[PDB]
Write a protein that binds this ligand. Structure first.
Ligand code: LYS
Ligand code: LYS
Ligand code: LYS
Ligand code: LYS
Ligand code: K
Ligand code: K
Ligand code: K
Ligand code: K
Lengths: 292, 292, 292, 292
């Protein structure tokens, strides 16, 4: 459902830039085998920006089909226009997905009242659970704790993916919401720290290529075994950093390809192929994690 | 026309959020009479995020129809997916627009090489002049002078709307491009400074309500009469700042309503109505400018 | 020694701006009674910048005398010139102080190698334990974890006061140093979070006026009772923030005066008296903490 | 003289870190012959942080003695304690200096009112012209245009060395002060831009090694010949940047040694010797400038 190691799964492509079913199946089977808790389909790492709404929906539905009830699937459903986010969410109503990951509007920099109205309107047009997603480095907007508090009062707003990397937010939000509101890290390099402070899991980029380690790290964290979890964290720390050596998901797609998890590392413009230097950096990080 | 005072025009809406032809007509007449150089249609200030492609195109064509050859129209054509930007541009080829204003991809944070490929691909598939648009505070990425220099070698790429407010960019770019490449400010509060450093004009929010003063300011600047231009700028400075007291174009639409230029100040979610405190601040700024 | 609630004690003054012995005695007795773990004398909150070296030394020695072995005393000994920091430290050698709090050089923005050489040289000219102090908002310099690691190899460099407010630093530093290196927060508003992550205590501004609450919060933290500690934290959160409503130690001196702990709230220029609005804000924070 | 190219001169040292009279003489002769407007003695670049008051005064008096009336000398007189700044200023009254350069207090982060009181008190107790110095990246505080406007009403406060690199400050300050208040850049890389916007000169690091080119650049700027000035600036731009590749004045002292202007590149801790990579970068910048 909404705890533990949740993968922000890549949308693997063929050389033409369209979804590769065989690759997607291999990834999903990998996550089932590895103990991943849930899959976020067509979030940021899944190239939401460069799929059209139909393509996006096809990937989500394919991912649900391939998961075949073995692993819960959360759909990316954000938009910077409220009407468009409502449309997208409505596509998944009564679909099998367990909830939605919905990003603060990007580019148009709404106020906190705007963010409140946007997410409230979206929640009102679905029965699905909603996970808010805050990532100001990408959006130009910052969904502050006070506003998360106001939104957490809406019945089906049930958690947040907090991708600021600002660890003070964990307890700021926790004090304004009920004990069942879920706090998930959106920042792999700080996620263990984030769980140590009270968070419930991570929506992870690193879990694409280190799924078993991430699941084990998160289990240990949930049980309060921080020192054991840190050892795993330290082995993964170069990936947590170097998967952003070039823009996400350029490095993680290459890593998936190098590990034999996907057929090609193709992306859509304006994402471009990994540089030679980037390959060498990511390769070293994979070697450090024991994956290669 | 790509120099002087260029208005980033509001998209006036009725109470249902649909484009108000009558209000738009009144704005376009105002710009023609007030000496505005050109109209940017469905830019940021025109709520490009919350119009769908069809609506966006309708507004541009309506603007061209109402302008009736009396003022040049530049279309907002940016996207964060290169295929989508190409597609949107094709809809305007042979429309009568004089050029396009194309923003760096937002949210996905491409590399400089990605930006280069993005804009090169867009330019390749049109004969329309392209004006690059850099606004890191909205997009999460920053198109740097080195990359602007690379792109300025593309025949069709003719200028940049530089909205960082970082005035060192003027001469960093100027020294890498030819004399005929246009440097336009996208930051009203620093625009006169930008012109004094060698910029050619401004793509302006303030121009929506102070069109004549903007046009005269930019002419005086182009002639080197900076002290005279500065007097105008000082009367407009509160508006340059307070049109962003709440997210653009919330204040400017309320200002246009208050002057009588549009029938309603309605916006689309996630933009929300101006607060009372914002009305007060904006009205005071209009009065400082001598407009009310 | 170097754990729990450590007060960054004010240097109380008379109306002429010189140390008030009676006030200092009242504070010290308060900290003994309250369970404060140690006193940092003439740190930042003690107005190190505006005492001359003789005055600084007189305050430290007076504080040691008044403490009368009841509470350990750590001297502020930082300087932005290495020779000057060595001179100051040498004043306290064989004095009774238990260690030194030594800030990264300010203003001159040395490199990390510079910071390494500065602190190594200082440590070499004393047998006293050294606590490094990182506060980039004040110094223009940031002592990174890697360099803290290099310094922690020097026998008498034994801990750090980490005043970035960046909670990721706790585990970054912890992984590079031995298990006996002390990690203390320098940021009251994040300090409980900092202890939750592995830190050992706080050098606190808030402890000047909430000494018993701070000591109890830190004891609960050390014992792993985070939820009980948070309740205390929440009552103190407005002070942790509002003691910086005007520049430290302007608010905390006023609060000390209002509580009857010191005779006057006088400071030395360029610190200036608290504003009326500041008094009202700090008063409300004191009322929230139950102290007034 | 408070206009044109003003050098922030190095304090040349022998291998023991004491001032080298012979090297200083050679620098002063160089500045006299190269048309530098004035010499700032024991500013930032002159290692004011690591000289004691007596040494600082000795260097200023030695500079005046060697200058022998042939070039004006401005003393660095700032401090972070207002009494200390007053005291240091008194040592120079009737010395033959033409003015003082006085930095905003560093480390203690005073309010704007504190800055106002600080500088007003210093100005009150001298008849020497005072030049305010704003450099937030070093001090932790930012003297804002509104406060500069307040201080410019003090008879003795005659200008500002604005080292933010934020070029919007030029005209924000200019509009609040009289026509005779001097605006000087303290950021070599943006200095020509600063002059083009209405600044009167530059207090320069680059001028230590490119005195003639700096002097001609600033004259051309003062005459309005910006394109001609820009040609010079483009040859100096790598030096403007690479003199800060390691902390100032590490690079510039090594550059002066490499040109033969000083006998040693020695600095005081916490400044440390230039790295090999830094030598390479700086030498390349000197060659681009045509100096080697
Ligand atoms: N590329 C546009 C539309 C994406 C459609 C959602 N899959 C944006 O990021 O909003
Ligand atoms: N709302 C989406 C699609 C808008 C279509 C362009 N008018 C975005 O900002 O990319
Ligand atoms: N005010 C100067 C000297 C202070 C002397 C130390 N108590 C500085 O902050 O370095
Ligand atoms: N090193 C101390 C005192 C220097 C005295 C002035 N030359 C500071 O930067 O304030
Ligand atoms: K809820
Ligand atoms: K071109
Ligand atoms: K040690
Ligand atoms: K004056």
């Amino acid at each position: 459902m909404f705890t533990g190691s949740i993968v922000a799964i890549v949308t693997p492509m063929d050389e033409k830039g369209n979804v590769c079913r065989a690759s997607l199946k291999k990834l999903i089977d990998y996550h089932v085998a590895s103990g991943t808790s849930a899959i976020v389909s067509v979030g940021t790492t899944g190239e939401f920006a460069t799929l059209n709404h139909d393509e996006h929906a096809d990937v989500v539905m394919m991912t649900l089909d391939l998961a075949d009830g073995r692993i819960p699937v959360i759909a990316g459903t954000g938009a910077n226009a409220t009407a468009e986010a409502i449309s997208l969410t409505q596509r998944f109503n009564d679909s099998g997905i367990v909830g939605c990951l919905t990003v603060t509007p990007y580019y148009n920099r709404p106020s906190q009242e705007g963010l409140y109205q946007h997410f409230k309107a979206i929640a009102e047009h679905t029965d699905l659970p909603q996970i808010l997603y805050n990532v100001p480095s990408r959006t130009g907007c910052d969904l502050l704790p006070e506003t998360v508090g106001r939104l957490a009062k809406v019945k089906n707003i049930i958690g947040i993916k907090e991708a600021t990397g600002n660890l003070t937010r964990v307890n700021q939000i926790k004090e304004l919401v009920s004990d069942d509101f879920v706090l998930l890290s959106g920042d792999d390099a700080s996620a263990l720290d984030f769980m140590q402070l009270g968070g419930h899991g991570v929506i992870s980029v690193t879990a694409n290529v280190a799924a078993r380690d991430m699941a084990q790290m998160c289990k240990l964290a949930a049980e309060g075994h921080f020192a054991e979890a840190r050892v795993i964290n330290q082995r993964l720390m170069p990936l947590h950093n170097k998967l952003f050596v070039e823009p996400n998901p350029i490095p993680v797609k290459w890593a998936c390809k190098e590990l034999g998890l996907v057929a090609t590392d193709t992306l859509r413009l304006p994402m471009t192929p990994i540089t030679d230097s980037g390959r060498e950096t990511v390769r070293a990080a994979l070697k450090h994690a024991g994956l290669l």
